[PDB]
């Protein structure tokens, strides 16, 4: 039955490709060519958070658009007051090989994980004052690459063991496990409604997951290399997935296909981070070429370069109110651009 | 600036704590353990005492070594190998009792991040290597080995084959042979790490 099953799978893939082609009637550039360009977006560094001592691998924004958590390779996850560049917390990590961090939407918990296979949840609102490791979510066999908070209890994590796992920080167990990626899952993004989320795996694909039922809905492909970052459109109806192919791409949830590729011939270095703007008109993508390029999300043209980092930028993210862009890099500096 | 002064005080205090912790952590020597599965990484890391990264630490002749055994990471190496860009060396282990490790050594010696780090090559299972030589020709592993089937020549040929993978001018591969029962591995690591420390500090000053 192996031959019949393989033939059925090939026929299903062909049918999916045919449906995706049939749903394709026009391109994004064909429609958004008539709109006026955004001009030259000359963002300038307003703040430079000179706290960390090693490579910065992740950084996340609080829901208040002011506080930011930054996890570095020096075994520290400092929490940043962006307006004053003040440090509010400095959480020493048991394992210094961390490559992700999250800031809870309520602002109570901070997650952090990495090569130790365990996602660690920290309680910032402890009565004793000090930040305590409220939980250490174990169960992954590979490095934890991403982790996002749905609420103070739930949390979804993406690991290098080709599986995504939804946890419950109270019981400390995998409520749902997501399987289907054929390679390391190096990125994750949760929808604004926190009911859906998409992960970008190293097998040059991005899958759509439902947090509740735990069944994959749609598989998005088109990249030629490992995807290192993923981010939803602010409407939650689309997402962008920058990869190591030196090209970012825009995918549509409803159209089930890519809409625009943000590739420039001068760029050869892979993307480490992708993040839209509050209006979704800009796609600030961080490149391993030591520079970050602001992309016109509708016309696929560059509108400015956030150069100023002496090493590869590893993380990027706009505030909730869109008032700023924060970029981390391996030079140990986090810069606030506005 | 009402109680933001106390916030600034707290930020300065924890910045000082960060600086002190970084200074304390910079003293330790970071090393990376690599090799094939069951190649002897566990044996060497356990004979010196003390499924994720199995970090190991010890003190030897006033140096604090930190051996980051990453054998439990059964995934793509390239997606996390750049994290160890700051390691002093890459302690590499090969079980001479058993070809598979040569490709991994070639990949890790020509990696774009490890063009400067010096790979230390350990060859364990010397007695088992001799036993296999007596039982079977050493040409089984390498059919192109046009030489006698003796330990003194087969081991040298394997060492030369491993070292041939080097292509950088400013990196050196150190080699040693062990019988899986020698306590001199710590001294060998100490000598190699002292040499690598001198070379790296000279490169940083521009004198190298």
């Amino acid at each position, epitope marked *: 039955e192996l031959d019949q099953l393989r033939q059925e799978a090939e026929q299903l893939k062909n049918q999916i490709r045919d449906a995706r082609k049939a749903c394709a009637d026009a391109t994004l550039s064909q429609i958004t060519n008539n709109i006026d360009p955004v001009g030259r977006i000359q963002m300038r560094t307003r703040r430079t958070l000179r706290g960390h001592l090693a490579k910065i691998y992740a950084m996340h924004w609080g829901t208040d658009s002011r506080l930011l958590v930054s996890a570095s390779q020096d075994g520290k996850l400092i929490i940043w007051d962006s307006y004053t560049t*003040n440090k509010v917390h400095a959480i020493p990590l048991r394992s210094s090989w961390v490559m992700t961090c999250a800031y809870a939407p309520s602002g109570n918990y901070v997650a952090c994980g990495g090569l130790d296979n365990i996602c660690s949840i920290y309680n910032l609102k402890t*009565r004793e004052g*000090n930040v305590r490791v409220s939980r250490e979510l174990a169960g992954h066999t590979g490095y934890l690459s991403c982790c996002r908070f749905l609420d103070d209890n739930q949390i979804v994590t993406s690991s290098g063991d080709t599986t995504c796992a939804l946890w419950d920080i109270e019981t400390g167990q995998q409520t749902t496990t997501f399987t289907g990626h054929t390679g390391d899952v190096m990125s994750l993004s949760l929808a604004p409604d926190t009911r859906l989320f998409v992960s970008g795996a190293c097998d040059a694909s991005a899958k759509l997951w439902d947090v509740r039922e735990g069944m994959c809905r749609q598989t998005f492909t088109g990249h030629e290399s490992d995807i290192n970052a993923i981010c939803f459109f602010p409407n939650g109806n689309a997402f962008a997935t920058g990869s190591d192919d030196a090209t970012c791409r825009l995918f549509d949830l409803r159209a089930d296909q890519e809409l625009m590729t943000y590739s420039h011939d001068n760029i050869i270095c892979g993307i480490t981070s992708v993040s839209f703007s509050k209006s979704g008109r800009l796609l600030l993508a961080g490149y391993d070429d030591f520079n970050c390029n602001v992309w016109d999300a509708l016309k696929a043209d560059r509108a400015g370069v956030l150069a100023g980092h002496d090493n590869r930028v590893s993380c990027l993210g706009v505030t909730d109110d869109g008032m700023a862009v924060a970029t981390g890099s391996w030079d140990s500096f986090l810069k606030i651009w506005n | 600036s*009402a*109680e*933001e002064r106390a916030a600034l*005080e*707290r930020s300065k205090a924890i910045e000082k704590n960060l600086k002190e912790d970084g200074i304390s952590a910079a003293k330790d020597v970071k090393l990376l353990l690599l090799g094939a599965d069951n190649s002897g990484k566990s044996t060497i890391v356990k004979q010196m005492k003390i499924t994720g990264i199995v970090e190991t630490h010890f003190t030897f002749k006033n140096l604090h070594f930190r051996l980051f055994d990453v054998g439990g990471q059964r995934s793509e190496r390239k997606k996390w190998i750049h994290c160890f860009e700051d390691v002093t060396a890459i302690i590499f282990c090969v079980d001479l009792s058993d070809h598979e490790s040569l490709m991994l050594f070639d990949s890790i010696c020509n990696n774009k991040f490890f063009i400067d780090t010096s790979i230390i090559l350990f060859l364990n299972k010397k007695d088992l290597f001799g036993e296999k030589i007596k039982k079977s020709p050493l040409t089984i592993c390498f059919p192109e080995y046009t030489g006698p089937n003796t330990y003194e020549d087969a081991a040298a040929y394997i060492q030369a084959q491993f070292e041939s993978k080097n292509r950088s001018p400013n990196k050196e591969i150190y080699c040693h042979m062990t019988c899986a029962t020698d306590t001199n591995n710590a001294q060998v690591i100490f000598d190699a790490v002292t040499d690598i420390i001198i070379a790296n500090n000279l490169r940083g000053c521009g004198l190298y």
Partner: single-chain antibody
Amino acid sequence: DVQLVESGGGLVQPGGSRKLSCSASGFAFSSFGMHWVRQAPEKGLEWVAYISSGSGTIYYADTVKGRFTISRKNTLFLQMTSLRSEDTAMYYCVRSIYYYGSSPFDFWGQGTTLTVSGSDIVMTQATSSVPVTPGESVSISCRSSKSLLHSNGNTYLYWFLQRPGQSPQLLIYRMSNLASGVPDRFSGSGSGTAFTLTISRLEAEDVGVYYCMQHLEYPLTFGAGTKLEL
């Protein structure tokens, strides 16, 4: 759990001295700034001193400066010299750590009883006492000598509830935020100079004396307080 138990009670002849101690446990004392607040046998609260984390900054009251010295094993010492007649008061031990979103003055010690044989932002509560029945709405007014809305956007009015015979509990910090453990029945509002603490669905435990405290600039001047008697 968290605790600030303190000792040093007794009777001192005028001109004496004492080294008051505050035994702290259940929290990272070295990472908190410890205050000292006192109550006269009949009057309201009054700030005494303040020591910060790391002992970087130390402040004292106008009538306390020089005479009383603060210092810190998880134990805080208020080295106290030249006791006078006016120094007789129930000294309290209060912790406070300041950062963006923090809750200063949150926990208060059980207090210790001691007996002896120009730019102040004075806060005034016109209503000395308000007779209010359970289950009804109550309101306690507060004033200031200057606007408490700093340029950073935060008003620094703090509200404390002192049950009869118990330590004060931080009810509202920065005039709008509700401290942890405080029920939703308590609310506060104000703008610049006039502040109002709103209490809905009054209960038996809410009976006590309510204090309005400013934090825009040291000294932390305290209001006269409203005795919301049952």
